[PDB]
Amino acid sequence: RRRRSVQWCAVSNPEATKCFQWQRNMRKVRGPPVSCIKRDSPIQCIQAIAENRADAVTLDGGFIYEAGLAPYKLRPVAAEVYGTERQPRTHYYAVAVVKKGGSFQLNELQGLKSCHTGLRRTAGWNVPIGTLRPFLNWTGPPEPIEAAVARFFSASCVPGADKGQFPNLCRLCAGTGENKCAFSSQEPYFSYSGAFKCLRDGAGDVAFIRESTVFEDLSDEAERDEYELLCPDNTRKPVDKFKDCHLARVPSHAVVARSVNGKEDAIWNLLRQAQEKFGKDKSPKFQLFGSPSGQKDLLFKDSAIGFSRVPPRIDSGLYLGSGYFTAIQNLRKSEEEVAARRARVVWCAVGEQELRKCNQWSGLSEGSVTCSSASTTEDCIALVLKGEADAMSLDGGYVYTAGKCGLVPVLAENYKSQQSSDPDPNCVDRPVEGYLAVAVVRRSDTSLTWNSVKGKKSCHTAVDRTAGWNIPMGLLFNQTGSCKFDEYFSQSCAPGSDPRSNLCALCIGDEQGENKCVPNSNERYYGYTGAFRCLAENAGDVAFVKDVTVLQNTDGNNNEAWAKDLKLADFALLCLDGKRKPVTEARSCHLAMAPNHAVVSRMDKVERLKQVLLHQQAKFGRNGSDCPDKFCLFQSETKNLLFNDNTECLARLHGKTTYEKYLGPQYVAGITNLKKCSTSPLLEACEFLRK
Ligand SMILES: [Ce+3]
Ligand SMILES: [Ce+3]
């Protein structure tokens, strides 16, 4: 019996009591064991877990944030599920409840009394204070935002607030002795029910709680009818219209654990069983989501219906969402800073080389652009979802992943039109035509055709990319129906695959032979140029890139060791009909048309991003002023850093504003079918966050 049990952290004795009886009800059913640690508060529980004196604790969104900061760096592993089994949900609503009779609105709360669940809590603090910020006249740090709130409401109860500094924030609290304004059950006006009671007793005029509270504490439509909700559009509405009248939709509470060795498996298994044996209306003995007559929400939310496992790739920031995560951060910043962040564009670069060019561009951007980075394209997508970065140009294959994650396309890379336009002046409005995905091979391997490419050595720009992967693998998968992608070719270089896999054999990493198969420019065989090089150096027999890639790296067009002497004539294209044509005939010999690369971003940065990039390219574009005098956005010496060097300009999407519409139904269907074989951690995570 190696595992002794999962160590749960309680924050009160009544919680510890419910814990201990959970422990015995567990072994009584012979299920996974669970012990109980005792502490005074969430942060104590958070610390206890970070230093191995405990394993799990469930926290509100506000503390999930805290719990995720250094040195704790805890992770949300399971989310509470609310609603009904018919329509479950891993989120709830932060609303403002008031009694019928008054007439004030959400914008007329000054001088009135308020009831909060507790300091730093989602519904009780972070959401309402964030929503009311423009009425607070707060001047920003180092002046605590609390002081501003203390001057806004004539009085209130904010469990946990500093009684000495902000006595006004505790004035309404009903706790006796040193328990007044206590962040615990001792304070009768603590948490959702507490803050709600504070409203009923008349101590306050407005309570900031979740949508269910009124339905949980009031069993009788008659009473519920004495209450209303303050909607952000400054109007009132029935307490059952929260879906149309809430201050914010927020992620449910979640059990958190260490990221080091958190024993996620143990916790999940314990929660999985506990949910079935003592879950919602399961056993009469013990009840996981129920509490005594004088208690509420002990260990978990009362009336919650179960747990939902949280995908491994999700950290606290990702779990909280772009909006909420940054909203919390914005509570600790002046309005000048927030507005400044709202105006700048944080590009994310993949790898050091892209980072170097980004910084170079940042310095010449006049404060409009700054940089961030990760070692893979997906990590960057994660950084954008967290608000730590805002934009990047992606291959169509990635636009798909970015789309499933909620990001949208904003501008596309435009290439030289089907035929001569002469440094086009209307490049910005010339619809994109896509580029040609082809399969290149050496002229000399005369017997190599498309019908016999299987089993050979392959070169791919990277896994999940259009020309290099989605199209060639999709064509082959359509034939065999086999998901065993790593057997399509004897061996290859497909950056982004498993290093121990044959899909990585041919890769060569960088000069030191490091970063083998890494999906960024450090791997010399990465991307278009990298995949072609993989062929030109006889590493592979076929390379899946686009047509203009050969042209650019042959006939002196690229003066680099490996490509200095390569000639266009020494390469051919494999057509789907078995024929072999010269690269110059790609127009009638290509695997498929691929949608252009596009710049993606969050919906909230679209307009700003669009005007910044348009200004920036006018300055450093193909025919920009400062290029090549000072800097050129679309140049990186055949490195295709940040953008494709053959980018004429960034153009408008003419309506194709979503990934589904930009990539097109067919390509999207094709990719989806390809994903059935396997999904990445990013997609797994985004699927979870979209539910
Ligand atoms: Ce909450
Ligand atoms: Ce591409």
Give the topology, please.
Blueprint (H helix, E strand, L loop, with lengths): L5 E5 L2 H16 L5 E5 L3 H9 L6 E3 L1 H8 L6 E9 L4 E2 L1 E9 L13 E4 L5 H11 L12 H8 L2 E3 L33 H10 L5 E5 L2 H5 L3 H4 L2 E5 L3 E4 L9 E4 L2 E4 L6 H15 L27 E4 L6 H5 L1 H9 L4 H9 L1 E6 L1 H12 L5 E6 L2 H9 L6 E3 L1 H9 L3 E7 L20 E8 L14 E4 L5 H15 L10 E3 L33 H10 L5 E5 H6 L18 E4 L5 E3 L9 E3 L3 E4 L4 H15 L28 E3 L7 H5 L1 H11 L5 H10 L1
Parallel strand pairs: 1-2, 7-8, 7-9, 15-16, 20-21, 20-22
Antiparallel strand pairs: 3-13, 4-5, 4-13, 4-14, 6-9, 6-10, 6-12, 10-11, 17-26, 18-26, 18-27, 19-22, 19-23, 19-25, 23-24
The structure holds cerium (III) ion (2 copies).
One cerium (III) ion binds next to helix 4.
GO molecular function: cysteine-type endopeptidase inhibitor activity; DNA binding; heparin binding; iron ion binding; lipopolysaccharide binding; membrane destabilizing activity; protein serine/threonine kinase activator activity; serine-type endopeptidase activity
Protein name: Lactotransferrin
Family: Belongs to the transferrin family.
* CATH architecture label of the largest domain: 3-Layer(aba) Sandwich
Give the end-to-end Cα distance, rounded to a whole number of Å. 37 Å
Report the count of strand segments. Answer: 27
Q: Can you give the helix content as a percent range?
A: 25-40%
What name is given to the CATH topology of the largest domain?
D-Maltodextrin-Binding Protein, domain 2
Shape estimate: elongated
Total tally of structural domains = 4
- State the fourth-level CATH superfamily of the largest domain: Periplasmic binding protein-like II
Q: What structural category characterises the helix and strand content?
A: alpha+beta
The main pleated sheet reads as: 7 strands, mixed
